[PDB]
């Protein structure tokens, strides 16, 4: 409720400013003005052409490393249990395996961008 | 022993950040085993009363179950107060 | 005559290696740059208040032409 | 009275953003032996007003090649989410008291990247596209590290509630036991806000203007407003995390004054850092946060999970 | 009304699925998955789970950010397709909406729809629990037990992630 | 000089102080001069909903003391 | 962002300086050298001076 | 009178525009060196509210500082056409005024005014940084005299 109003107000204000920006000023539109910007000379090829990603391997590793926060963020609550010996063992076990995962991709040239 | 203090010196010169990492992570796996206070972390967690202490039915043969909360029987948190 | 600009070898004694390790971890040489710009903040700016203050010139200045008389 | 409370939040934020532009231009000027704005109003106090009016009465143009709906949505999304990062902030009483405030700010921060990605892609320009793909690279660099750093600091606090960080730091600041995390958090906020030396999504010297190269007039202002509102918000987050202020229930004003000063000084440091260092390469940023911070962050996450247990100092759950 | 908040979010949840199921440019497909992942946080959040709601949303924002980068590199053409650019995409988008509309229309009028399963339309609030919990969040307690009870789940999930990194490097080595 | 930068900081500082001050006063205004109730867990909410019934005016911040027992 | 080929297209500041110097006396051609490397003005004059 | 109120609004927008002039980062030849010295500490054009921005779409002024060649002329008009209005052009130096030292060259445009409209001409080879700053201040006073709203009102 209070969150819905806070969200509703924040985006309504942003939408009004955009509305004002497009309707308050004087407009003068012609083809040259709206042409794509590439430093004064016409572009060669569409901007929609493929753009190679040289860090693709790190991007995939990001997904696997971005899950660990899901599994590691519950740790503050997990520390409130009576089985600290078990909880501590499996908390360090999960982080150690992440370190091994980073170590493998590092030593195997996986963090180095393709040329 | 001379060689051992030549690989450590090389990594400390070429990768100091990794030397700190393995030291901090190493101390995290060992100290909990050696620390005398690891028992109290487990005892404090047990002493935290999330649930209601449902009473037992006095059958006349439970000498170690307190009749009243202010009775000497039952677990005591005297250790925790002085910790 | 000449001189090398980047021909040096860092001493490998333990104290020096630890000094560099502290620099790498504690960002010592990045804080000198902060100190250098901090000092400039407290120096008087060199900005003149144009058009009320004009940059100095000399009699030889070559500006707008004019036709002279006796 | 809640609508008034929201207005008493967003409206001051915009004024703070407006005059943070003036402060940056003068602070950089004096660090560069200049004065900065001192003509438009006494000591340049009316400069933000002139720039705001100028941009909103200037012609906005949609590029002929742009995707119109994404082109207009992106600036709205940036400012809308920029203001949304403030509602869980305890100063000392939050507008929306969230039990998971820390997690809410992470999700909103990630969602705010798409205002950069979609603005660049919708522009249909090569320079806007290159800057947008630097945002992908830059978010892959800090997002994982930034979460674990927060996790290590919450293992001394107890929960994800931001108001609970005030209770944690009542006897002492968190920057003493966790200055190694504070250093890596501070540099992670620079990357997250796209600030120098990590201003790669824009990269004036490399990409002219980056993702917002095609935007002009009012639409450009929203991106500018969001960027500066994020600097203050993140520096408020840093103060609450590592420079917690003492809370007196009967004098909440004293908290705001001390808490406000700590945020300004952290905000000045952002201006200070922009005037001192060159710009990273967006592939060197990835190696910085994956080969230096991440190995240490994982080690400090193990240490901060074991340290409370081996000293019997586990914080309360509630 | 505010008593139908979950149902309203669920309708938006479906509309986001008809967004990327019509298969426009993966740029717009990834936008529908962000929308459905945001309301999905809201639906799960209204049933008592806030960590789950903010975690799936947090995870799916990371995934779509990588997918956006891959789309501009592997899955782009000169004219990316919008929902109005193909009769195939538009037909799938309109068909999905008209099917959601009739499911909503019948479940709100009759309050009873039978498609494979018997569904009721008295409001999602009628099945909630009438007894408050204690001084803790039940979902947080359950997730926090992954490290005390779910030791075997931690080992298999931990091993899978480690093997995941090894696997992707082998697949992408080439030559 | 460097102290001509301060006026901008003062205006910025006053603007960042308002959000905290307004929330504190508005909370006290709308809760009978007390802090807004923090209900993070269901037990705290159950006690807040109980306060509304006890109040008799449908407000959880209208507390009834020992004058209500007899 | 990897560069495969740099192809510097120059001549956007070609003004025919070398052709103009042919219609100017040696004194009249001196200021043309202040405007070649316009960051090193008195070093371009000197090279031309030593040549003449 | 209603023409008094528009005149005050006309003053407001005029004030907002001359106090926030953003030149395009566009230099061609030696005259750009004197354009940097205007941004240097001694003159500090930034204190007048004048800030360079690289994108033509985020600029209000084009300072054509240097020689304009036939190869560069199409590019100059392109970045000028892409500036959102209102936009102003300041011609700096003899080369951009009337061709200057290279007026009779086969590869030089005899004046940037052949390609784009010009509002202020700054003479010199090069103009001093104090002469360009005088030109920008003359442009501001030229914007102060605009009466768009008092001409719209009288239509
Ligand atoms: C305005 C009001 C005052 C502002 C605050 C004072 C300015 C502080 C920053 C500038 C300091 C001046 C520069 C200086 O003295 O540093 C030189 C010195 C000299 O550095 P160095 O690179 O020449 O070498 C010193 C170390 N050895 C020789 C071993 C390599 O730098 C330092 O020693 C800085 C050490 C501080 C390390 C702190 C890092 C962690 C910070 C945690 C967050 C807190
Ligand atoms: C485009 C811009 C769209 C808006 C951007 C916001 C995206 C959704 C935000 C998620 C809300 C949230 O998680 O709040 C958690 C917060 C976290 O709080 P909490 O989980 O700690 O619980 C608060 C109350 N206690 C502690 C007592 C249990 O939830 C709340 O504080 C209040 C919940 C109110 C119910 C909100 C659900 C409806 C909102 C659905 C909006 C979905 C829009 C998604 C669109 C995405 C596409 C861009
Ligand atoms: C180069 C960049 C890195 C440096 C960035 C540093 C920017 C942040 C500067 C923080 C310095 C500490 C704050 C000093 C100025 C504000 C002090 C204040 O208002 O509160 C009084 C503060 C104390 O207020 P306090 O409320 O925080 O109390 C101390 C902390 N507890 C709550 C645990 C008791 O006094 C000082 O800071 C003196 C030092
Ligand atoms: C009970 C369970 C807890 C124990 C967990 C067991 C797993 C531990 C490891 C988990 C983290 C993964 C790291 C393992 C890989 C180590 C790094 C590595 O393999 O790098 C290989 C390295 C290649 O480097 P290169 O380019 O060839 O140049 C240098 C020449 N060596 O060349 C090399 O040969 C590496 C050099 C030797 C590295 C030794 C690493 C030792 C790590 C443990 C240190 C613990 C001691 C510190 C704590 C002490 C207490 C304070
Ligand atoms: C480290 C403790 C200090 C040891 C020391 O400095 O004693 C001197 C000794 C010899 O130094 P030197 O002859 O110059 O060259 C090194 C030859 N092994 O130095 C040595 O021989 C030490 C050989 C290296 C062994 C340590 C390498 C691992 C990194 C240790 C970090 C030390 C700094 C930590 C901070 C200490 C202060 C709290
Ligand atoms: C005194 C206290 C003793 C502490 C232990 C000191 C010895 C640790 C040695 C660790 C360094 C391993 C050897 C090494 O230096 O490898 C360097 C190599 C450099 O790689 P790079 O620079 O990118 O390219 C090659 C250019 N030469 O780097 C590599 O290629 C591989 C780097 C491995 C990365 C490991 C990342 C793991 C980080 C998490 C740390 C916690 C590990 C889990 C805990 C295990 C212990 C319980
Ligand atoms: C180094 C890591 C430890 C850093 C310090 C931890 C925080 C601390 O200092 O706690 C000290 C505390 C003292 O107890 P105290 O607070 O005075 O309680 C009485 C109140 N009336 O007591 C504690 O909480 C911790 C006491 C144990 C010390 C922590 C390290 C474990 C000790 C292992 C002993 C085995 C030998 C260690 C050397 C081999 C390991 C390589
Ligand atoms: C229950 C409802 C079942 C779904 C029916 C919804 C109607 C979907 C068809 C929408 C129109 C369409 O997709 O095109 C007709 C299609 C021929 O394929 P089409 O892409 O039009 O190729 C010619 C032009 N490119 O022809 C078809 O594929 C029709 C399939 C039947
Ligand atoms: C619509 C409709 O009326 O046809 C439903 C059709 C027949 O199934 P049914 O209606 O159960 O049999 C007659 C019993 N009165 O059954 C269908 O054609 C429905 C096909 C749905 C696709 C099933 C694929 C497996 C998905 C499993 C999830 C559960 C599916 C049911 C929920 C979907 C409807 C909300
Ligand atoms: C330029 C040099 C300075 C450097 C920059 C520093 C940043 C600026 C300072 C931070 C911003 C604070 C500005 C406001 C401080 C002065 C006002 C104040 O302290 O509050 C007084 C407070 C009650 O004030 P208040 O609640 O606003 O009154 C009712 C309004 N309806 O009564 C109290 O209990 C508190 C006293
Ligand atoms: C392709 C789009 C699918 C259909 C969208 C819904 C409109 C068509 C439904 C017709 C039947 C009807 O009238 O249903 C309306 C329903 C029921 O809501 P309720 O609160 O029970 O209203 C009735 C009870 N009153 C009077 C107390 C309020 O509204 C919904 O919550 C459906 C989703 C709303 C649209 C969200 C997506 C944007
Ligand atoms: C979404 C909300 C806005 C929607 C658009 C409607 C408002 C447009 C503003 C101009 C209307 C108008 O005509 O203004 C008329 C008024 C006064 O009238 P007058 O002088 O007697 O009329 C003369 C009509 N002429 C001009 C055709 C001869 O002129 C003003 O001095 C108003 C200018 C400032 C307006 C506020 C900024
Ligand atoms: S006018 Fe003079 S200074 Fe300017 S470009 Fe031409 S020759 Fe160089």
Curated annotation (Swiss-Prot), chain B:
Which residues carry the post-translational modification N-acetylalanine, per the record? Answer: 1
| Region annotation (Disordered) ranges | 55-83
Q: Which GO terms describe its cellular component?
A: mitochondrial inner membrane; mitochondrion; respiratory chain complex I
For membrane topology, the record states: Single-pass membrane protein
Q: Which parts pass through the membrane?
A: 17-37
Principal localization reads: mitochondrion
The lineage's top-level taxon is: Eukaryota
Q: Does the keyword NADP apply?
A: no
Which controlled-vocabulary keywords does the entry list?
Acetylation, Electron transport, Membrane, Mitochondrion, Mitochondrion inner membrane, Respiratory chain, Transmembrane, Transmembrane helix, Transport
- Where's it found, cell-wise? Mitochondrion inner membrane
Q: Name one Pfam family in it.
A: NADHdh_A3
What family does the Swiss-Prot or TrEMBL record give for this protein?
A: Belongs to the complex I NDUFA3 subunit family.
Subunit composition?
A: Complex I is composed of 45 different subunits.
Instruction: Quote the function comment for this protein.
Output: Accessory subunit of the mitochondrial membrane respiratory chain NADH dehydrogenase (Complex I), that is believed not to be involved in catalysis. Complex I functions in the transfer of electrons from NADH to the respiratory chain. The immediate electron acceptor for the enzyme is believed to be ubiquinone.
Q: What is this protein called?
A: NADH dehydrogenase [ubiquinone] 1 alpha subcomplex subunit 3
- Which taxonomic lineage is given here? Eukaryota, Metazoa, Chordata, Craniata, Vertebrata
Curated annotation (Swiss-Prot), chain D:
**What keywords are annotated for this sequence in UniProt?**
Electron transport, Formylation, Membrane, Mitochondrion, Mitochondrion inner membrane, NAD, Respiratory chain, Translocase, Transmembrane, Transmembrane helix, Transport, Ubiquinone
Q: Where in the cell is it found?
A: Mitochondrion inner membrane
Top enzyme category: translocase
Q: Which GO terms describe its biological process?
A: aerobic respiration; mitochondrial respiratory chain complex I assembly
One Pfam family for this entry, by name? NADHdh
Modification N-formylmethionine occurs at:
1
Which transformation does this protein catalyse, written as a reaction?
a ubiquinone + NADH + 5 H(+)(in) = a ubiquinol + NAD(+) + 4 H(+)(out)
Q: Does the keyword Translocase apply?
A: yes
- Enzyme Commission code(s) on record: 7.1.1.2
Q: What protein family is recorded?
A: Belongs to the complex I subunit 1 family.
Assembly and interactions?
Core subunit of respiratory chain NADH dehydrogenase (Complex I) which is composed of 45 different subunits.
- What is the protein name given in its UniProt record? NADH-ubiquinone oxidoreductase chain 1
Q: Which organism is it from?
A: Bos taurus (Bovine)
Curated annotation (Swiss-Prot), chain F:
Primary location: mitochondrion
Q: Which UniProt keywords apply?
A: Electron transport, Membrane, Mitochondrion, Mitochondrion inner membrane, Respiratory chain, Transmembrane, Transmembrane helix, Transport
Entry's localization field: Mitochondrion inner membrane
Regarding the membrane, this protein is recorded as: Single-pass membrane protein
Q: Which domain of life is it from?
A: Eukaryota
TM region positions: 1-21
A single Pfam family it belongs to is MWFE
Question: An example Gene Ontology cellular component term from the record?
Answer: respiratory chain complex I
Q: Which family does it belong to?
A: Belongs to the complex I NDUFA1 subunit family.
Its function, per the record, reads: Accessory subunit of the mitochondrial membrane respiratory chain NADH dehydrogenase (Complex I), that is believed not to be involved in catalysis. Complex I functions in the transfer of electrons from NADH to the respiratory chain. The immediate electron acceptor for the enzyme is believed to be ubiquinone.
State the oligomer form and interacting partners: Complex I is composed of 45 different subunits.
Protein name listed in UniProt: NADH dehydrogenase [ubiquinone] 1 alpha subcomplex subunit 1
The root-end lineage is: Eukaryota, Metazoa, Chordata, Craniata, Vertebrata
Curated annotation (Swiss-Prot), chain G:
> What does the record give as the function of this protein?
Core subunit of the mitochondrial membrane respiratory chain NADH dehydrogenase (Complex I) which catalyzes electron transfer from NADH through the respiratory chain, using ubiquinone as an electron acceptor. Essential for the catalytic activity and assembly of complex I. Redox-sensitive, critical component of the oxygen-sensing pathway in the pulmonary vasculature which plays a key role in acute pulmonary oxygen-sensing and hypoxic pulmonary vasoconstriction. Plays an important role in carotid body sensing of hypoxia.
**Encoding gene, per UniProt annotation:** NDUFS2
Q: Which residues carry this modification: Symmetric dimethylarginine?
A: 15
Full protein name: NADH dehydrogenase [ubiquinone] iron-sulfur protein 2, mitochondrial
**Can you summarize the PTM annotation of this record?**
Dimethylation at Arg-15 by NDUFAF7 takes place after NDUFS2 assembles into the complex I, leading to stabilize the early intermediate complex.
Compartmental location: Mitochondrion inner membrane
Q: Which organism is it from?
A: Bos taurus (Bovine)
Its subunit composition reads: Core subunit of respiratory chain NADH dehydrogenase (Complex I) which is composed of 45 different subunits. Component of the iron-sulfur (IP) fragment of the enzyme. Interacts with NDUFAF3. Interacts with NDUFAF7. Interacts with CERS2.
Q: What's this protein's family per the entry? A: Belongs to the complex I 49 kDa subunit family.
């Amino acid at each position: 409720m209070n969150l819905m109003l806070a969200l509703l107000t924040n985006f309504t204000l942003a939408t009004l400013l955009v509305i004002i920006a497009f309707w308050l000023p004087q407009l003068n539109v012609y083809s040259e003005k709206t042409s794509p910007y590439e430093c004064g000379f016409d572009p060669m090829g569409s901007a929609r052409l493929p753009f190679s990603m040289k860090f693709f391997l790190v991007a995939i590793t990001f997904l696997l490393f971005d899950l660990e926060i899901a599994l590691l963020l519950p740790l503050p609550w997990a520390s409130q249990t009576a089985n600290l010996n078990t909880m501590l063992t499996m908390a360090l076990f999960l982080i150690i395996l992440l370190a091994v995962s980073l170590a493998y991709e590092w030593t195997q040239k996986g963090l180095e961008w393709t040329e | 022993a001379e060689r051992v203090a030549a690989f450590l010196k090389n990594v400390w010169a070429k990768e100091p950040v990794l030397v700190a990492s393995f030291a901090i992570a190493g101390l995290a796996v060992i100290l909990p085993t050696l620390s005398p206070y690891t028992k109290y972390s487990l005892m404090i967690n047990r002493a935290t009363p999330y649930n209601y202490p449902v009473p037992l039915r006095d059958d006349g043969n439970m000498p170690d179950v307190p009749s009243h909360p202010q009775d000497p029987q039952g677990p005591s948190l005297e250790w925790l107060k002085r910790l | 005559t000449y001189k090398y600009v980047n021909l040096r070898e860092p001493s490998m004694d333990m104290k020096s290696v630890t000094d560099r390790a502290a620099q790498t971890l504690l960002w010592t040489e990045l804080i000198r740059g902060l100190g250098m710009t901090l000092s400039y903040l407290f120096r008087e700016p060199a900005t003149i208040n144009y058009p009320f203050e004009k940059g100095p010139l000399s009699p030889r200045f070559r500006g707008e032409h004019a036709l002279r008389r006796y | 009275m809640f609508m008034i409370n929201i207005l008493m939040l967003i409206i001051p934020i915009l004024l703070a953003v407006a005059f943070l532009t003036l402060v940056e231009r003068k602070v950089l000027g004096y660090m560069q032996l200049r004065k900065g704005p001192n003509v438009v109003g006494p000591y340049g106090l009316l400069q933000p007003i002139a720039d705001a009016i100028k941009l909103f009465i200037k012609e906005p143009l949609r590029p002929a090649t742009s995707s119109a709906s994404m082109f207009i949505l992106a600036p709205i999304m940036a400012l809308g989410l920029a203001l949304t990062m403030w509602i869980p902030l305890p100063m000392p009483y939050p507008l929306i008291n969230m039990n998971l405030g820390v997690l809410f700010m992470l999700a909103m921060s990630s969602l705010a990247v798409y205002s950069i990605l979609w603005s660049g892609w919708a522009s249909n320009s090569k320079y806007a596209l290159i800057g947008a793909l630097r945002a992908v690279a830059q978010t892959i660099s800090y997002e994982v590290t930034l979460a674990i750093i927060l996790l290590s600091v919450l293992l001394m606090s107890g929960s994800f509630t931001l108001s609970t960080l005030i209770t944690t730091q009542e006897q002492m600041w968190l920057i003493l036991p966790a200055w190694p995390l504070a250093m890596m958090w501070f540099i992670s906020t620079l990357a997250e806000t796209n600030r120098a030396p990590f201003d790669l999504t824009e990269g004036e010297s490399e990409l002219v203007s980056g993702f917002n190269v095609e935007y002009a007039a009012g639409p450009f202002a929203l991106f500018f407003m969001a960027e500066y509102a994020n600097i203050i918000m993140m520096n408020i987050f840093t103060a609450i995390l590592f420079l917690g202020t003492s809370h007196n229930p009967h004098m909440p004003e004293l908290y705001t004054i001390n808490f406000t000063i700590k945020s300004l000084l952290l905000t000045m440091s952002f201006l200070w850092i922009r005037a001192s260092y060159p710009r990273f390469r967006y592939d060197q940023l990835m190696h910085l946060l994956w080969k230096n911070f991440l190995p240490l962050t994982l080690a400090l996450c193990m240490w901060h999970v074991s340290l409370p247990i081996l000293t019997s100092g586990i914080p309360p759950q509630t | 009304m505010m008593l139908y908040i979950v149902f309203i979010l669920s309708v938006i949840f479906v509309m986001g699925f008809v967004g990327f199921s019509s298969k426009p440019s993966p740029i717009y497909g990834g936008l529908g998955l962000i929308v459905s992942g945001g309301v999905g946080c809201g639906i799960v959040l209204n049933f008592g789970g806030s960590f789950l709601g903010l975690m799936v949303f947090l995870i799916y924002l990371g995934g779509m950010m990588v997918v956006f980068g891959y789309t501009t590199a592997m899955a782009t053409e000169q004219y990316p397709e919008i929902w109005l650019s193909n009769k195939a995409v538009l037909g799938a988008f309109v068909t999905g909406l008209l099917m959601e509309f009739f499911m909503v229309y019948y479940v709100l009028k009759d309050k009873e729809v039978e498609v494979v399963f018997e569904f009721n339309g008295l409001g999602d609030w009628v099945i909630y629990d009438t007894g408050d919990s204690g001084f803790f969040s039940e979902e947080a307690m359950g997730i926090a037990a992954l490290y005390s009870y779910g030791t075997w789940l931690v080992i298999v999930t931990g091993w899978s992630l480690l093997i995941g990194v090894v696997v992707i490097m082998e697949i992408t080595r080439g030559n | 000089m460097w102290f001509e930068v301060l006026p901008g900081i003062a205006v910025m500082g006053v603007c960042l102080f308002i959000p905290g001050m307004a929330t504190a006063r508005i909370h006290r205004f709308s809760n009978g001069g007390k802090e807004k109730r923090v209900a993070h867990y269901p037990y705290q909410w159950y006690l807040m909903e109980r306060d509304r019934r006890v109040s008799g005016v449908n407000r959880s911040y209208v507390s009834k003391g020992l004058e209500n027992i007899d | 962002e990897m560069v495969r080929k740099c192809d510097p297209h120059i001549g956007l500041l070609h003004r025919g300086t070398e052709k103009l110097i042919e219609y100017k006396t040696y004194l009249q051609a001196l200021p043309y050298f202040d405007r070649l490397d316009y960051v090193s003005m008195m070093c371009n004059e000197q090279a031309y001076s030593l040549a003449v | 009178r209603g023409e008094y109120v528009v005149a005050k609004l006309d003053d407001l927008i005029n004030w907002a525009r001359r106090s926030s002039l953003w030149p395009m980062t566009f230099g061609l030849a030696c005259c750009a060196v004197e354009m940097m010295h205007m941004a240097a500490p001694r003159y500090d054009m930034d204190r007048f509210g004048v800030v360079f921005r690289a994108s033509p779409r985020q600029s209000d002024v084009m300072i054509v500082a240097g020689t304009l060649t036939n190869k560069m002329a199409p590019a100059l008009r392109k970045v000028y056409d892409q500036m959102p209005e209102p936009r102003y052009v300041v011609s700096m130096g003899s080369c951009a005024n009337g061709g200057g030292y290279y007026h009779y060259s086969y590869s030089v445009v005899r004046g940037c005014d052949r390609i784009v409209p010009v509002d202020i001409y700054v003479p010199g080879c090069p103009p001093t940084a104090e002469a360009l700053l005088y030109g920008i201040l003359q442009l501001q006073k030229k914007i102060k005299r605009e009466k768009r709203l008092r001409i719209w009102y009288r239509r």
